Nucleic acid binder design. Structure first.
Ligand SMILES: Nc1ncnc2c1ncn2[C@@H]1O[C@@H]2COP(=O)(O)O[C@H]2[C@H]1O
Ligand SMILES: Nc1ncnc2c1ncn2[C@@H]1O[C@@H]2COP(=O)(O)O[C@H]2[C@H]1O
Ligand SMILES: Nc1ncnc2c1ncn2[C@@H]1O[C@@H]2COP(=O)(O)O[C@H]2[C@H]1O
Ligand SMILES: Nc1ncnc2c1ncn2[C@@H]1O[C@@H]2COP(=O)(O)O[C@H]2[C@H]1O
Lengths: 203, 200
DNA sequence: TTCGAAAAATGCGAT
DNA sequence: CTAGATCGCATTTTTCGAAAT
DNA sequence: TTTCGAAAAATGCGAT
DNA sequence: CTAGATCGCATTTTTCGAAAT
């Protein structure tokens, strides 16, 4: 932390959420902004039957609930769920705008994050439009294997995730994921036992 | 609109005829665009050349903003003119200088990125949750309620090819063709050539 | 580090 | 022709809270 | 400112 | 099973720019 973060937080209300809890409900009126002090969350949307699609994972340093800031009468566009325990700062849009008046760098930071999220989401549209499930899963496994929470392994990198969650990322049933992971292992591209998956030749 | 006039006085104005390329995907991003007149399409292509439309943008919209917040970024997509366009262009360097004297310019830009993220997230949901028939129906209906839609005694009228609908929903032109025939069979639309009447 | 539920995840497979 | 979604249960595998170290 | 005949672009095939 | 992608071309629309009154 530094004097700027402390200055910012002194204008916020800090709350702690346990793993699996819901921070933002899709459809509710948006009047506040959040800043992740510690922890990680998953951004998701769902269909009429409850099927879920994960749009993104966010971490400490990331703002959340920002899309309603620029125009009143807006509703939350997605659900945000705590992936681990989280410490989150909350502030009304009304007061956040006053803070921008005294220190506009805060808007620059928020804007940069939205820009990155738009590039990532546009790429997802492409993957879904141009790639079959095998290609989407293959790319998703390589991407996770290169994140900072991924563990090293003599044959490449190791990650821990369920077939169901992979299905929520790539847009397919958990059964299809399971059948493809076995084919990938037969082709000796990976090794998977339980939630532990080893991605080979990532190095 | 003092700021708007102030902003434009620092830009270079260019014109692009319909179908021309304003932004090439993969090239280095160093300049920001602002549409003064006309409309464009933002699209991505696969290795085989198939295309997918991410969005249509119109007068008042910024373009090429994604490479501004990080160094060494490349254009994330192609931008092609749909109609003849009049566009204001300014370097990232100079734009940053304008942000300093009046950060409200960044506010208007951020507001558009916020809306584009909401829209693109909705598109992800549609691609993952709806079959082609459902995606085509929603698209026909949204197009029919846009300002450029024509009045018709049976509802609203639009003009578009089966190939373009295919680039919007992510399916082959042949599939769009078969689905439009089935939707006509259900009396939801009437299609002759590029002209489609959405009953209402 | 440990151990026994509790609860979560997984395999099924011809249409 | 090629890809995938389904569905009800019985089995695995993982998580969790408190003892044991 | 209407009309018209190419080029160009778009569409149907439809069992596999 | 249900949903969609494919391919080689002849045929059906659209788009255009030049010619007229
Ligand atoms: N097209 C899709 N088909 C099936 N499940 C999907 C799809 N898109 C997203 N999902 C979600 O991904 C999840 C993967 O595990 P489940 O089969 O339990 O439930 C699935 C849905 O919630
Ligand atoms: N595509 C996305 N990528 C990343 N974060 C998103 C995306 N869509 C929505 N969000 C976040 O989820 C939040 C849900 O509530 P808001 O709409 O207020 O603000 C949204 C963003 O912070
Ligand atoms: N899954 C897809 N299958 C086919 N075409 C697609 C797909 N996704 C995007 N497209 C594009 O949309 C276009 C629709 O018409 P075409 O079949 O001529 O060419 C198609 C591609 O350029
Ligand atoms: N999902 C999207 N919705 C709207 N506009 C987009 C989207 N993705 C990219 N763009 C625009 O297309 C531009 C391509 O170049 P840039 O990446 O510089 O900036 C991008 C945005 O201005």
């Amino acid at each position: 932390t530094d004097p700027t973060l402390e200055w910012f937080l002194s204008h916020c209300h800090i709350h702690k959420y346990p793993s699996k809890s819901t921070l933002i409900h899709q459809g509710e009126k948006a009047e506040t902004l959040y800043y992740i002090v510690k922890g990680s969350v998953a951004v998701l949307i769902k269909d009429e039957e409850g099927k879920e699609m994960i749009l993104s994972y966010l971490n400490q340093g990331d703002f959340i609930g920002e899309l309603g800031l620029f125009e009143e009468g807006q509703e939350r566009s997605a659900w945000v769920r705590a992936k681990t325990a989280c410490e989150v700062a909350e502030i009304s849009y009304k007061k956040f705008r006053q803070l921008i008046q005294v220190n506009p760098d805060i808007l620059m930071r928020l804007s940069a994050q939205m820009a990155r999220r738009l590039q990532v989401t546009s790429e997802k549209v492409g993957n879904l439009a141009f790639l079959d499930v095998t290609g989407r899963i293959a790319q998703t496994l390589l991407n996770l294997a290169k994140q900072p929470d991924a563990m090293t392994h003599p044959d490449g990198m190791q990650i821990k995730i369920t077939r169901q969650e992979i299905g929520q990322i790539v847009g397919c049933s958990r059964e299809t994921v399971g059948r493809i992971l076995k084919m990938l292992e037969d082709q000796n591209l990976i090794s998977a036992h339980g939630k532990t998956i080893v991605v080979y030749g990532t190095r």
